[PDB]
Design an enzyme around this catalytic site. Structure first.
Site, PDB file in Angstrom:
ATOM      1  N   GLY A 243       0.817  -1.223   0.000  1.00  0.00           N
ATOM      2  CA  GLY A 243       0.000   0.000   0.000  1.00  0.00           C
ATOM      3  C   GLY A 243       0.840   1.258   0.000  1.00  0.00           C
ATOM      4  O   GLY A 243       1.950   1.235  -0.558  1.00  0.00           O
ATOM      5  N   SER A 244       0.327   2.306   0.644  1.00  0.00           N
ATOM      6  CA  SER A 244       0.877   3.680   0.622  1.00  0.00           C
ATOM      7  C   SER A 244       2.296   3.726   1.203  1.00  0.00           C
ATOM      8  O   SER A 244       2.990   4.718   0.950  1.00  0.00           O
ATOM      9  CB  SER A 244      -0.040   4.640   1.339  1.00  0.00           C
ATOM     10  OG  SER A 244      -1.387   4.443   0.953  1.00  0.00           O
ATOM     11  N   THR A 245       2.713   2.705   1.953  1.00  0.00           N
ATOM     12  CA  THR A 245       4.081   2.591   2.541  1.00  0.00           C
ATOM     13  C   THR A 245       5.121   2.711   1.418  1.00  0.00           C
ATOM     14  O   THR A 245       6.206   3.298   1.667  1.00  0.00           O
ATOM     15  CB  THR A 245       4.242   1.298   3.357  1.00  0.00           C
ATOM     16  OG1 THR A 245       3.636   0.162   2.723  1.00  0.00           O
ATOM     17  CG2 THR A 245       3.669   1.456   4.751  1.00  0.00           C
ATOM     18  N   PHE A 246       4.738   2.223   0.232  1.00  0.00           N
ATOM     19  CA  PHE A 246       5.566   1.916  -0.965  1.00  0.00           C
ATOM     20  C   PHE A 246       5.704   3.142  -1.874  1.00  0.00           C
ATOM     21  O   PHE A 246       6.454   3.101  -2.875  1.00  0.00           O
ATOM     22  CB  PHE A 246       4.869   0.789  -1.721  1.00  0.00           C
ATOM     23  CG  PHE A 246       5.629   0.153  -2.851  1.00  0.00           C
ATOM     24  CD1 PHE A 246       6.683  -0.706  -2.601  1.00  0.00           C
ATOM     25  CD2 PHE A 246       5.249   0.352  -4.163  1.00  0.00           C
ATOM     26  CE1 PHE A 246       7.370  -1.324  -3.639  1.00  0.00           C
ATOM     27  CE2 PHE A 246       5.927  -0.278  -5.200  1.00  0.00           C
ATOM     28  CZ  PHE A 246       6.982  -1.119  -4.935  1.00  0.00           C
TER      29      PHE A 246
END
Length: 521
Positions: A243-246
């Site tokens: 997800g948005s971590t990436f």
């Protein structure tokens, strides 16, 4: 003796102990060549005397002394794993036909503790030979095992093949004190949200040492409770759409390629790709905004916009250069490589914000490390040494290596600034990850989850894998903390809103406090 598994401060995580098993000879034939009877004479009175240990039911003890027409009898699981104190008490009684046989059992002092990393050793009833079946215990079976003396081999690690026998000890980078904070916090999450899967890892920002790691559901190594449900270690063997971590990596790539400017504006809202309205998380956007705010607000459009600017073929290379779709070459068995989703424009764009593409949580730790070590990705390692403690011979010794430097020092510092905003911006969508007296930074990570075998994504109210990839103190951090929760089943709303904040804050606060980092109240 099978060797011991220690932590980084040489506290025992696993060892051999000698425990005892209750056997009673119940057949007069034993006493037919002896004055002194070697068989239970008074079933009733022996039974009452014995009812000082375990299931002290004199009736049930008698029933088994009367049982069948066998020569000996055991007492199921309650008549095994009896302590030395439990033994000495039954030996003082000096009952006729009652004995205690020593069997060596594998003892995990903390019980359920890094259970998916340490692993568990099973016993051969026949020989009493312990063989590791998961985690450290399986990987370093041969080194730990005091038996054999054939060829010693490391499970999947090609190399390190060295050719009354005690075994070799395995030291880990784990810090029991920290591993506690984690284990407690994770229990906290399972009570609150009861997710289908959950994990947290602490890493030294400067070394790549795994200071702590548990997951849920795990098992209890001592007891064999739940062992063999989830075989997969989250940190090493389990793949995620992160997800948005990436976005953090997509961002860095852009920053360097020169396509990202904090102040330059872009159109937030939607992007019709391959006939699909891929939209920001609020479906509408925030209109024309700076790219800095877009990152702070986790904008999927921004990442897709930047992908267009930089170029597809250029970005695939970038994701490759952050070590995605390739093993970390860590010391765990059957590590997962994942794969970068790029078979078409949809996969590509979705990837930018962290879907289609699959990662090990470690692949991510590796990558995030770059932002704090002047662009250098540290290889993460949990194994400190394998070394026989008679000889002191270090068979393997671990150390900090560098898996790559995919970015400049400059680039890194700029990514750091953006992470500092994500949490400590005036317009932050993530002040829930703030901590009193310590300065934090990191990246929020809401993401859909795939239907295991075929189909598309998992449907529900909030069918999300929420993560956070935090580090403190900001700019010059001591530790990284990556926590992830998959498909909360209770409080599934609070999950979407807070994310793993309720786990991260405790772990980080306690860890920093324990490493004696100062608190600017």
């Amino acid at each position: 003796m099978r060797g011991k598994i220690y932590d980084r401060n040489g506290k025992v995580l696993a060892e051999d102990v000698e425990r005892y098993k209750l056997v009673a000879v119940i057949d007069k034939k034993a006493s037919a060549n002896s004055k002194k009877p070697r068989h239970v004479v008074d079933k009733k009175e022996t039974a009452k005397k014995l009812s000082t240990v375990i299931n002290m039911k004199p009736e049930e003890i008698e029933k088994r002394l009367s049982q069948k027409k066998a020569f000996q009898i055991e007492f199921g699981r309650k008549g095994t794993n009896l302590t030395y104190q439990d033994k000495l008490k039954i030996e003082k009684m000096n009952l006729p036909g009652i004995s205690l046989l020593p069997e060596t059992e594998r003892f995990y002092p903390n019980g359920n503790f890094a259970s998916h990393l340490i692993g568990r050793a099973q016993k051969n009833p026949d020989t009493g030979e312990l063989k590791g079946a998961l985690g450290v215990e399986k990987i370093f079976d041969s080194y730990l095992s005091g038996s054999k003396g054939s060829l010693r081999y490391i499970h999947d690690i090609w190399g390190y093949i060295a050719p009354p026998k005690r075994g070799d000890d395995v030291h880990l980078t784990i810090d029991s004190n920290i591993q506690v904070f984690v284990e407690e916090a994770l229990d906290g999450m399972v009570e609150r949200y009861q997710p289908k899967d959950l994990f947290a890892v602490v890493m030294d920002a400067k070394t790549g040492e795994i200071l702590a790691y548990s997951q849920r559901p795990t098992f209890n190594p001592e007891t064999g409770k739940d062992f063999g449900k989830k075989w997969a270690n989250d940190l090493y063997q389990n793949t995620y759409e992160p997800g948005s971590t990436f976005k953090s990596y997509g961002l860095a790539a852009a920053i360097q390629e020169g396509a990202f400017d904090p102040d330059k504006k872009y159109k937030s809202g939607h992007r019709d790709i391959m006939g699909s309205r891929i939209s920001d998380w609020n479906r509408v956007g925030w209109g024309e905004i700076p790219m800095s705010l877009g990152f702070t607000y986790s904008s999927n459009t921004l990442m897709m916009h930047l992908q267009d600017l930089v170029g597809a073929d250029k970005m695939k290379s970038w994701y490759e250069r952050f070590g995605f779709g390739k093993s970390t070459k860590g010391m765990f068995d059957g590590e997962a490589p994942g794969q970068i989703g790029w078979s078409n424009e949809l996969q590509q764009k979705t990837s930018s914000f962290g879907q289609s593409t699959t990662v090990t949580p470690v692949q991510m730790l590796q990558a995030q490390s770059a932002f704090f070590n002047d662009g250098n990705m540290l290889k993460p390692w949990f194994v400190n040494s394998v070394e026989n403690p008679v000889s002191k011979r270090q068979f393997y010794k671990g150390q900090k290596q560098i898996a790559g430097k995919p970015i400049t020092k400059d680039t890194a510092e700029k990514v750091e600034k953006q992470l500092d905003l994500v949490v400590n911006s005036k317009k932050s969508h993530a002040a829930n990850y703030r901590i009193d007296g310590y300065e934090v930074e990191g990246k929020t990570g809401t993401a859909q989850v795939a239907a295991p075998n075929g189909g598309g994504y998992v449907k529900g109210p909030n069918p999300y894998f929420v993560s956070f990839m935090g580090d403190a103190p900001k700019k010059n951090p001591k530790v990284i903390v990556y926590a992830g929760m998959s498909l909360a089943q209770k409080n599934d709303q609070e999950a979407y809103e807070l994310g793993v904040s309720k786990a991260f804050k405790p772990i980080m606060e306690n860890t920093l406090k324990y490493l004696n980092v100062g608190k600017s109240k």
